[PDB]
Design an enzyme around this catalytic site. Structure first.
Site, PDB file in Angstrom:
ATOM      1  N   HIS A  42      -6.028  16.325  19.646  1.00 43.50           N
ATOM      2  CA  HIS A  42      -5.281  15.225  20.235  1.00 43.50           C
ATOM      3  C   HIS A  42      -4.320  14.569  19.238  1.00 43.50           C
ATOM      4  CE1 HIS A  42      -8.238  12.129  18.712  1.00 43.50           C
ATOM      5  NE2 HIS A  42      -7.143  11.388  18.720  1.00 43.50           N
ATOM      6  N   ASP A  82     -11.724  19.045  21.440  1.00 48.47           N
ATOM      7  CA  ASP A  82     -10.759  18.280  20.648  1.00 48.47           C
ATOM      8  C   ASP A  82     -10.810  18.729  19.186  1.00 48.47           C
ATOM      9  OD1 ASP A  82      -8.895  16.409  19.894  1.00 48.47           O
ATOM     10  OD2 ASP A  82     -10.192  14.670  20.050  1.00 48.47           O
ATOM     11  N   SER A 179      -9.010   8.915  13.934  1.00 50.64           N
ATOM     12  CA  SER A 179      -9.118  10.157  14.698  1.00 50.64           C
ATOM     13  C   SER A 179      -8.706  11.386  13.896  1.00 50.64           C
ATOM     14  CB  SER A 179      -8.232  10.107  15.961  1.00 50.64           C
ATOM     15  OG  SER A 179      -8.741   9.172  16.885  1.00 50.64           O
TER      16      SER A 179
END
Ligand SMILES: C[C@H](c1ccc(N2CC[C@H](NS(=O)(=O)/C=C/c3ccc(Cl)s3)C2=O)c(F)c1)N(C)C
Lengths: 228, 52
Positions: A42, A82, A179
């Protein structure tokens, strides 16, 4: 990282930072070898062009990416799969504050690492849900969370490619900008990659946990990605 | 608790059970020591070690 502590000299040497054209960090990554970085799929949508910075604990060396290998099953809808592997143009020189985390063998990781009480998440993300990126690299010990508790706490489906970690009430969590970064698990003074910071319903929100990509589910994928 | 379930079979890193006995192994960049349990770094900056 909300809460936690500053990474001291040499403590989080596998941390990588993805930086946009304007040299701003927007996601983390984990050093796997001199040429390879692990990150979240992502993250690849948060910038058109980006480079990888390693070694800086205080944003106040840069490597370009040669190949981006993104899991073809990643879906923006569920965030399942992911994961992404980056091959750099030039090899990373290991030194103080720059070293790879170990990739574990799958069955052993599942029985020995994923069963430990805690792992460690790190990054240059926000220190409060509303805030600026951290200029200092931070780390936070996060307890592994029972899968059932995890699914019960979540407004979204937790797939088998994901796991929960964090605190239910204590206000400590990964946050925006973290992230793609490392979740590692210590075993006899050796740190193994066990997760990729993936998503969360806010940061450090009561009754919520951080959601991580389960690296064990992708060990073969990673190994194959690092050959071509 | 027996074999790999008992203190990781005394292995530094990977423990597997083959034919009812412990077999230890190591991550890339380490060599298994002569005792068949410890993992020895082959260089500077072996994976997973803090640079302290
Ligand atoms: C499951 C997935 C999904 C749910 C929630 C989010 N959100 C909503 C806000 C949050 N953004 S954030 O603050 O940058 C990430 C925070 C994290 C906290 C703990 C982590 Cl591990 S990652 C986040 O990741 C998401 F990005 C994705 N779907 C709904 C798109």
């Amino acid at each position: 990282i909300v809460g936690g502590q500053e990474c001291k000299d040499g403590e989080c040497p596998w941390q990588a930072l993805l930086i946009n054209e304007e040299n701003e960090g927007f996601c983390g990554g984990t050093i796997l070898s001199e040429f390879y970085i692990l990150t979240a799929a992502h993250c690849l949508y948060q910038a058109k062009r980006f480079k990888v910075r390693v070694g800086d604990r205080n944003t106040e060396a840069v490597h370009e990416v040669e190949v981006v290998i993104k899991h073809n099953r990643f879906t923006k809808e569920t965030y399942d799969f992911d994961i992404a592997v980056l091959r750099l143009k030039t090899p990373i020189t290991f030194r103080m504050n720059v070293a790879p985390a170990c990739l574990p063998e799958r069955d052993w990781a599942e029985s020995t690492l994923m069963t430990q009480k805690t792992g460690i998440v790190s990054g240059f993300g926000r220190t409060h849900e509303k805030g600026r990126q951290s200029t200092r690299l931070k780390m936070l010990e996060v307890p592994y969370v029972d899968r059932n508790s995890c699914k019960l706490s979540s407004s979204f489906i937790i797939t088998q490619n994901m796991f929960c970690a964090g605190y239910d009430t204590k206000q400590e969590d990964a946050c925006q900008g973290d992230s793609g970064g490392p979740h590692v698990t210590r075993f006899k003074d050796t740190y193994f990659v066990t997760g990729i910071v993936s998503w969360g319903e806010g940061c450090a929100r009561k009754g919520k946990y951080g959601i991580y990509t389960k690296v064990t589910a992708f060990l073969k994928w990673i190994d194959r990605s690092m050959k071509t | 608790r027996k074999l790999c379930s008992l203190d990781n079979g005394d292995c530094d890193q990977f423990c597997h059970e083959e034919q009812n006995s412990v077999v230890c192994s190591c991550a890339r960049g380490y060599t298994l020591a002569d005792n068949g349990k410890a993992c020895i770094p082959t260089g500077p900056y072996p994976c997973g070690k803090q640079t302290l």
